[PDB]
Each structure stands twice: as C-alpha cells, then as structure tokens.
Ligand binder design. Structure first.
Ligand SMILES: CC(C)(CO)NC(=O)c1cccc(Cl)c1
Ligand SMILES: CC(C)(CO)NC(=O)c1cccc(Cl)c1
Ligand SMILES: CC(C)(CO)NC(=O)c1cccc(Cl)c1
Length: 282
C-alpha cells in the first residue's frame, strides 16, 4: 500500500502495536559473540543491545578492537551510517578513535546527557574553548572551536588532533536537544528541519566517511533518524515514489543492527516524518 493512506488505515483501526510486533517477529537474528566476551562487559551500556559480529565497527588496535557500534550500509539509497550507544566513562577515547579511523565528518546526538534524572551518556566533548580534552588511552586531543545554540538544536565546530601524527580535522557536532523525556514529539517539523541541516553540511555525503549517530542505546531515536533519511532519498531517486515501503526499509536496516525503532510510537512517528517530509521536498 501507499504510505499516507496505510497510515490513516492503521490509525483508524488502532493496530500500531500489532504492526510493530510483526516487525519484531520478522527481524534478523545474527550472532554477537564479541560483544558478550567477559572482557567487554564495561564497554556495553545495556546487556540486551549489542552489535552483530558481521557488521560491527572494529577499532584499529591489537589489544581490544571492540566498540558497541554498527555499520548500516544502504545499497540502493547509496548512504551509510554508523549507529552507536552514547559513550560510557571508559569508552570516550574509543569513540573519538572510531570517528578518526572511519574519516567521519559529523556526529549526530539525539539525547541530553541527563534525562529522567539519570545519566544517559558521558560528557564527551568540551564545553569551553579554553578547556580542551585529552584522551590519553587513544592519544587524541579535542577542542571546542565555536557553538551555535538554536531553539531545537545546537551545532558545534570541533577540532580533533591525532597527537601521534599531529594531523588535525574539523568535526561537526549536531545536537538535537528537545526530544521529550517520555514519548515522541507531537510534530515532526523540528526533527525534519534538523535532518536537513545535517544534510546541508555535507556530513552525509560520499566524500566523507559515514556519519556517527547516537542516542542512549543507539537503536531508538537513532533508528528514526536513519530510517527517515533513507526513505526520503529513495522517494527522490525512484520513478514511482509511492513504491517506497517503510516497513521493508526498516527490516533491511535491522539486518545490520538489532532493535532499530524501540516502540510502536516511534514507528508511527517515523511514518509521520516521512509523509510530511515528502511534501516539503517538492
Ligand atoms: C587514533 C590515534 C591514531 C590518534 O592518536 N590513536 C590511536 O590509534 C591509538 C589507539 C590506541 C592507543 C593509542 Cl596510544 C593510540
Ligand atoms: C578540513 C580538512 C582538510 C583538514 O583540514 N579535513 C578534515 O578536517 C577532515 C574531517 C573529517 C575527516 C577527514 Cl579525513 C578530514
Ligand atoms: C531542498 C529540498 C526541497 C529537497 O529537494 N528540501 C529541503 O530543503 C527541506 C528543508 C527542511 C525540511 C525539509 Cl522536509 C526539506
């Protein structure tokens, strides 16, 4: 079926939970043996969210190459994304090592450091120009260059230096700051505006390594971001845009990381975002 009318048909019939449970039943199951090794317990935020072995990002290190991060490679859309958990106190150096090694231009953050009164990820970037951060375990230096605070999101320019070679690179930090502590946003307008700002920066384009996107677990809000982006790109590329099937695209993405889209409300929000986005594109 088309999307907008499939949408109203699920709303009128109140069957979002049944649609979402079908997706969960049909989703891929692949091994995640490296994630479950005992030496990696303090590298995982949640025991039930792990990268598959076949698609995990490897650190270029011989001691321990493990990080909780996955490469989502979308062949028809010609887009790639790295989805990862919010960094932990003992993985902030690994996180920036990955950004460096994968040649990423941008980092997309969809959570606040504290939500619901608890810590959802480490404070992993510097908050003042004159107070830079040094990650001694991976030999990197990170400096805040500039910050632009808007009503729904903040964009930061960062300098990452490889202290071994003295090479430097400019990284863009795109921080969506207004996702509610509970539920999903009422309107997708600010989320779509944010997606378009990431696109306009070049961070999603083939002349760079894959964008790094995270929330707390790296599957819910993060899944919503890449699902909406890929669906809108396919609607632009194909002769018949009504052939784009968001459930099929989501199942394709779940070949590369488990659990993408965590609730039926996140599924409905993803439909809403793609529907409204497709009208603005033209
Ligand atoms: C990312 C770079 C190349 C930047 O200095 N660092 C490393 O690869 C690294 C990894 C593990 C340990 C240490 Cl000392 C450096
Ligand atoms: C702007 C320059 C030319 C360094 O001055 N390139 C980068 O900063 C950069 C950023 C991300 C990835 C990689 Cl490979 C390079
Ligand atoms: C340039 C086009 C028209 C794509 O062809 N779209 C946008 O610039 C845009 C901006 C904000 C929100 C949304 Cl959904 C689209």
């Amino acid at each position: 079926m088309e999307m907008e009318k499939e949408f109203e048909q699920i709303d009128k019939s109140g069957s979002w939970a049944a649609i979402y449970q079908d997706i969960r039943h049909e989703a891929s199951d692949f091994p995640s043996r490296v994630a479950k090794l005992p030496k990696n317990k303090n590298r995982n935020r949640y025991r039930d969210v792990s990268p598959f072995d076949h698609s995990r990002i490897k650190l270029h290190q011989e001691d321990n190459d493990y990080i909780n991060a996955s490469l989502i490679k979308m062949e028809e859309a010609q887009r790639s994304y790295i989805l990862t958990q919010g960094p932990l106190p003992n993985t902030v150096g690994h996180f920036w090592e990955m950004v460096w090694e994968q040649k990423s231009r941008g980092v997309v953050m969809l959570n606040r450091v504290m939500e619901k009164g608890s810590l959802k990820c480490a404070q992993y970037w510097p908050q003042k120009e004159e107070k830079e951060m040094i990650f001694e375990d991976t030999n990197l230096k990170l400096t805040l260059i500039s910050e632009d605070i808007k009503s729904y999101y903040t964009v930061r320019q960062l300098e990452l230096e490889n202290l071994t070679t003295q090479e430097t690179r400019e990284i863009l930090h795109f921080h969506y700051t207004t996702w509610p502590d509970f539920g999903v946003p009422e309107s997708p307008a600010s989320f779509l505006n944010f997606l378009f700002k990431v696109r306009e920066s070049g961070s999603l384009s083939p002349e760079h390594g894959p964008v790094v996107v995270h929330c707390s677990a790296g599957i819910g809000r993060s899944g919503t971001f890449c699902l909406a982006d890929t669906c809108l790109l396919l609607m632009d590329k194909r002769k018949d845009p009504s052939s784009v099937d968001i459930k099929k695209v989501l199942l394709e993405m779940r070949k590369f990381r488990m659990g993408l889209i965590q609730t039926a409300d996140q599924l409905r929000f993803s439909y809403l975002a793609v529907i409204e986005g497709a009208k603005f594109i033209m």
